[PDB]
């Protein structure tokens, strides 16, 4: 009556990307960061929910879960920076360039002693709706799958400590939740498995035409 | 009997029968959901008319066909060169596609309308649909299991996979209508403009795509086994903003 | 003064939660809403859409158009048996339908289904076919004698579309498990009563439509993961 | 009693935030406000100011006063082409203007621009020049024949200042990307129709003003960093 | 309509100064502190925002982000003092002089276990407006750039522990945010790069006259 | 402004406690109540039932 809605169907905390940061024994410069761009179509458990609609309109909620593990000399008492860059803006890849020390980007800090990282995000799409499937091409001729209109931003974690560094694993898992869920125009579900982002492939890896449909021998006995 | 709106009209209209597309009338866009003016010059008022397309051949073992809108009409009528030089626009559709039927032979076909495509083209590497295949024109894609343009960007021609990546039969999620013979001989489906953006390109971006999938193929044991299909499309709400030269 | 005490249970990790936390960038003004159809607030509209049933999903007809259509023959020699399918939405071949795969995303389900089957062949063919429902108590009886026993309506091929009858939800409680029940729920059965009557020089081979749709009353509670698709191979970053 | 629970999401690091936290030293009384002009609450007043356009920003005229003025000649022998510039504020040479560099601090932008071009030479010179706008759909056609095709107004050098015409925002949505679009938006074109008519013993060389200003309707959402200036060298402590 | 304001243009958390404190192996007295004075014109990303105005009137918000890194014997369980001194008042440079143990200066303490350091500041300028550009000279004849009227104070971090000390890196990054934003009299943006504080130089380091303006060959093709 | 102080006694482990904490999954609708006898709110109804006494509980 009330629970049967798109608010409950898409409103679940699910892991989207496995961001794993490993500390190198020796580095010339601060170049220890995970390279990852924004995406909604990643895993089969979450993508099939987006494959069921043409255009969606909902705000995003991002929960960061970083894992701390000690290895040598009780290493773990450190504070890390998690900065978000607005969509469209150019993103550098260094210690302190133009973006990492600016008052235009959203910045948050976490240290062990307080609660787990949890914050809300506003509207991300440039148009009225979020692009799930971009039919044809935009202003370019060849590119299909990822469009300039479907932009959300970028998420990168950066190291702060300079000399006092040792090999520690920082497993920063990102969870996603939906808010203000309003979508239109339902679609039929996907039949086969996914291989690449924004792509539903049939003829790939030379695998047989075996669908998820279970076969029955005589359809009279069952 | 005929639908009265323009000077040019088509016969065999009968009674307009279709399932209501989520309670939506083909709305003429006012200045409420737009910018300040965005109206340099008003187009033809009598532009809302029926356009007859060339009849395609019916095969004994029919696989299916598809036409993209407004890609199918690009050199047809007066509005052909207009929308090409005009920057971005939106249009509705009045679909009237059927063939001649008698009380003797058999043949059933289902018509759907889905404006998205995601088909496999390449192997492992970046996969991308062909530019020429997305824009065939009036002829469309004559779906036959053969080699076209050697081995290259090539969307696979499968009717039960629905091209986009969905299960057959369940494709009826969008405005759908089933056409038999004894109940109906003509097909009419109401189609408005449905998109995230108010105005988009016609040269690259596709607004809609007509889906033609037969459930019961033409299987008759008589003298003749060919019945051509008559395609009649009437564009709705033809509004465009952009002044440009006619010859280039 | 100020109540300073950490409440047990609160201030920790939780999966499903509602927060009134401040936004990261609330200064941005979103794009205005425009009139776009297909708008869904409830999940009843997706179930309302008529989904075609693949009644003949055998290994022979799996890669053809004949899998969704019913095989019919005009000759009067073969047994009168057509098909025997379940009533559960989480079972084959009703699992592949639109209402079936949505039910796979839920643990508890209840509701009735609409059944209409129209002729696919030529206009000059009339055949009386019987539609019957069987209780799940005992094993399914499949004979010609068990035609007019318990919920039986004979449909003749005329002009009108097939009017649906009573296919109700039979349970003591409002909710039942979503696990594939091959003997838990009832069965849908159809039998040949008359053979395809055709005049001289008329194609004997004909087919039949197979539709299913959700009714008015539907109540589904807790959500779950699907059991049809699994991903463990190569994934994109 | 007292609700003691740590709410997930709250009590951590955040970039943009609003706080009602107590002041460090609230006992100090600030200096009283006095009447000072230039007061801005919105960003519309900065865009209202007419910014001069460097139409001739070539490598030859870069270090001169002639970069902002238009080169004109009285002789009737050279082609009638003057310039071909874009309509985007985040593109050359409209990027160097007051409205251009402010638009570089934003991701989403919309609005119209005012265009007025007045004579810079002597009082005894009259020349009819045509102002034209071209759609971004196809590549820019640059001929003498494409003068009176689509939004065309001929301006004669008289006494009054140049009255601006319709240069509208053409888009299906309210917002479009701020990335430099060389084929995304329209073009501003001006052509020689008549040559500078001058009496005997009159300087043939003359120039023209090039102004641009923001209109009434402007809506910009999210802010960003500039792409014109970068600092990585020696900095002061 | 409402977001288009100076409140959003200057209201972003941006890093102003990189204060890095390093612990010496052996010291005769407590002399481990970072030398830094107040400044608004520091980085190009933040300065260009102030270069666009003559006089500003807004309260400041300061966020301190200190980084803790372990190196030897699990060193990191320490509490540091962050004291602010009012503008105009003389500031000493020792362990405990007249300022460090007074009830006239604003003092705050931080230890790992509580939330990140965050506090608000009142009005700082002696006049009605904050000085961005001081035209001419004041009561002195030569000095240009930093004036006595444009004073905000001083920020210095001090060590507390006496004998139990080891080499640890304390990266105390300072973020700045604006409150009560009311400014007047807009200016045109800066063309070249900055070299020194409160100074916009043209003829420096013998570099060619190359401006940020992108050149186009024929201005007819584009 | 906001009272930020940890109250002594609160914010720790406790055996018997009453909480107004949010539910894990509140979207689920429970099965409706039907008329079933034996309903007990107090412990007096269990004591009301006559219990037979084993008066001769010897080893024999």
From Swiss-Prot, chain F:
Interacts with capsid protein VP0 and capsid protein VP1 to form heterotrimeric protomers. Five protomers subsequently associate to form pentamers which serve as building blocks for the capsid. Interacts with capsid protein VP4 in the mature capsid. Interacts with protein 2C; this interaction may be important for virion morphogenesis. This is Capsid protein VP3. Coiled coil: none annotated. The chain holds residues 331 to 390 of 2150 of the full protein. Forms an icosahedral capsid of pseudo T=3 symmetry with capsid proteins VP2 and VP3. The capsid is 300 Angstroms in diameter, composed of 60 copies of each capsid protein and enclosing the viral positive strand RNA genome. It is found in: Virion; Host cytoplasm.
């Amino acid at each position: 009556r009330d629970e049967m809605s798109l608010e409950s169907f898409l409103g679940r905390s699910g892991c989207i990307h496995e961001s794993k940061l490993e500390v190198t024994l020796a580095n010339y410069n601060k170049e220890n960061f995970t390279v990852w761009a924004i995406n909604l179509q990643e895993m089969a458990q979450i993508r099939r929910k987006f494959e069921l609609f043409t255009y969606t309109r909902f705000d995003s909620e991002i929960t960061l879960v970083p894992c701390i593990s000690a290895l040598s000399q009780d290493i773990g008492h450190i504070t890390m920076q998690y900065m978000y860059v607005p969509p469209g803006a150019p993103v550098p890849n260094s210690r302190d360039d133009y973006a990492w020390q600016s008052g235009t980007n959203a910045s948050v800090f976490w240290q062990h002693g307080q609660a787990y990282p949890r914050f809300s995000l506003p509207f991300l799409s440039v148009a009225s709706a979020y692009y799930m499937f971009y039919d044809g091409y935009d202003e370019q001729d060849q590119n299909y799958g990822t469009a300039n209109t479907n932009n959300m931003g970028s998420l990168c974690s950066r190291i702060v400590t300079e000399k006092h560094i040792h090999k520690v694993h920082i497993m920063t898992r990102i969870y996603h939740k939906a808010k203000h869920v309003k979508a239109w125009c339902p679609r039929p579900p996907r039949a086969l498995e996914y291989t690449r982002a924004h792509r539903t492939n049939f003829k790939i890896e030379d695998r047989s035409i075996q669908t998820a449909i279970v076969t029955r021998p005589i359809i009279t006995t069952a | 009997i005929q639908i009265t709106r323009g000077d040019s009209t088509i016969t065999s209209q009968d009674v307009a029968n279709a399932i209501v597309a989520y309670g939506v009338w083909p709305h003429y866009l006012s200045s409420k959901d737009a910018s300040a003016i965005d109206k340099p010059s008003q187009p033809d008022t009598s532009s809302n008319r029926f356009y007859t397309l060339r009849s395609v051949t019916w095969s004994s073992s029919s696989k299916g066909w598809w036409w993209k809108l407004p890609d199918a009409l690009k050199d047809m009528g007066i509005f052909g060169e207009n929308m090409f030089y005009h920057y971005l626009g939106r249009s509705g559709y009045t679909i009237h596609v059927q063939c001649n039927a008698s009380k003797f032979h058999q043949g059933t076909l289902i018509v759907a309308l889905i404006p998205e495509h995601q088909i496999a083209s390449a192997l492992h590497g970046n996969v991308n649909v062909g530019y020429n295949y997305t824009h065939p024109g009036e002829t469309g894609r004559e779906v036959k299991a053969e080699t076209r343009l050697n081995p290259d960007l090539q969307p696979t021609e499968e009717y039960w996979l629905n091209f986009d990546g969905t299960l057959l039969g369940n494709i009826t999620i969008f405005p759908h209508q089933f056409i038999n013979l004894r109940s109906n001989n003509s097909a009419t489906i109401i189609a408005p403009y449905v998109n995230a953006v108010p105005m988009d390109s016609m040269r690259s971006h596709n607004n809609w795509s007509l889906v033609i999938i037969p459930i019961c193929p033409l299987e008759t044991s008589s003298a003749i086994n060919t019945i051509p299909i008559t395609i009649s499309i009437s564009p709705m709400c033809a509004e465009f903003s952009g002044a440009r030269a006619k010859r280039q | 003064g100020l109540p300073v005490f950490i409440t047990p249970g609160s201030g920790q990790f939780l999966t499903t939660d509602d927060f009134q936390s401040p936004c990261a960038l609330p200064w941005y003004h979103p794009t205005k809403e425009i009139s776009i159809p297909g708008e869904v607030k409830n999940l009843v509209e997706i179930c309302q859409v008529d989904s075609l049933v693949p009644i003949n999903n055998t290994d022979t007809y799996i890669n053809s158009e004949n899998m969704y259509s019913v095989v019919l023959q005009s000759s009067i020699n073969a047994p009168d048996k057509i098909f025997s399918i379940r009533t559960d939405v989480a079972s084959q071949p009703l699992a592949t339908t639109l209402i079936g795969e949505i039910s796979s995303y839920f643990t508890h389900w209840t509701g009735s289904l609409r059944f209409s089957f129209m002729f696919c062949g030529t206009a000059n063919t009339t055949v009386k076919l019987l539609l019957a429902y069987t209780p799940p108590g005992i094993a399914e009886p499949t004979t010609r004698k068990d035609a007019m026993l318990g919920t039986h309506v004979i449909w003749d091929v005329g002009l009108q579309s097939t009017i649906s009858m009573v296919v109700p939800w039979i349970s003591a409680s409002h909710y039942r498990n979503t696990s594939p029940g091959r003997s838990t729920s009832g069965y849908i059965t159809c039998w040949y009563q008359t053979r395809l009557v055709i005049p001289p020089q008329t194609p004997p081979t004909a087919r039949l439509l197979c539709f299913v749709s959700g009714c008015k009353d539907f109540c589904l509670r807790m959500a779950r993961d699907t059991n049809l698709h699994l991903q463990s191979g190569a994934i994109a970053q």
